[PDB]
Amino acid sequence: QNFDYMFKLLIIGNSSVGKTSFLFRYADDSFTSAFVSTVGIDFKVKTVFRHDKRVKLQIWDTAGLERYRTITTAYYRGAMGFILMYDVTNEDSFNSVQDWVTQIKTYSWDNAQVILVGNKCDMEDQRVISFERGRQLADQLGVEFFETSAKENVNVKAVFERLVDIICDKM
Numbered sequence: 001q002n003f004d005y006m007f008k009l010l011i012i013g014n015s016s017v018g019k020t021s022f023l024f025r026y027a028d029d030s031f032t033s034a035f036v037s038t039v040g041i042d043f044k045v046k047t048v049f050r051h052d053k054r055v056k057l058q059i060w061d062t063a064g065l066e067r068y069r070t071i072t073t074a075y076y077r078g079a080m081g082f083i084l085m086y087d088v089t090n091e092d093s094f095n096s097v098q099d100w101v102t103q104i105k106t107y108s109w110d111n112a113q114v115i116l117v118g119n120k121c122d123m124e125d126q127r128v129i130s131f132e133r134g135r136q137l138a139d140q141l142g143v144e145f146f147e148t149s150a151k152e153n154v155n156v157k158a159v160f161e162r163l164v165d166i167i168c169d170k171m
């Protein structure tokens with residue numbers, strides 16, 4: 001009664017890339033510099049308004065630590081969308097993207113949508129992955145791409161809005 005659509009979204013990617021911070025910025029417009037790893041999985045709910053429709057988002061923030069790989073992967077079932085995040089200052093996190101893609105292909109719905117996100121783009125002096133490299137990989141994968149900053153609120157809303165739109169279109 002209260003919404004027109006309800007989408008389960010997951011934020012996945014290596015530990016420390018900024019997944020919790022991404023959700024904190026989107027939902028609460030807040031940021032902390034503290035790094036406290038997520039245990040298991042957590043979620044927030046947010047309702048957005050798009051094309052005179054009410055879209056309820058149930059957004060799951062997954063732990064990136066390998067210790068929680070199995071329990072977070074159990075929640076891929078039923079997800080309509082994924083934010084697949086790496087950190088532009090962490091080459092390992094970028095190298096891990098194909099493995100995350102395989103995990104999505106294995107444990108999610110065939111028609112689940114995916115956006116690749118290179119976070120921490122404010123950290124230009126520590127950057128090791130260029131924008132162009134991120135976009136190149138996204139195009140090889142056939143997915144949309146954004147660089148973001150949870151810290152300075154760059155493109156965070158844009159990612160969620162685009163993900164809602166491509167899920168809606170795929171329907």
Ligand SMILES: Nc1nc2c(ncn2[C@@H]2O[C@H](COP(=O)(O)OP(=O)(O)NP(=O)(O)O)[C@@H](O)[C@H]2O)c(=O)[nH]1
Binds near residue numbers: 015021150
């Ligand atoms: N400069 C900068 N720091 C960021 C940004 N996003 C997150 N951080 C910092 O990166 C660290 C890890 O962030 P966090 O959101 O906890 O990462 P996570 O991906 O949720 N880690 P985990 O998978 O272990 O739960 C924190 O110190 C946080 O302040 C960003 O856009 N820019």
Ligand SMILES: [Mg+2]
Binds near residue numbers: 019020036037038064
């Ligand atoms: Mg976290």
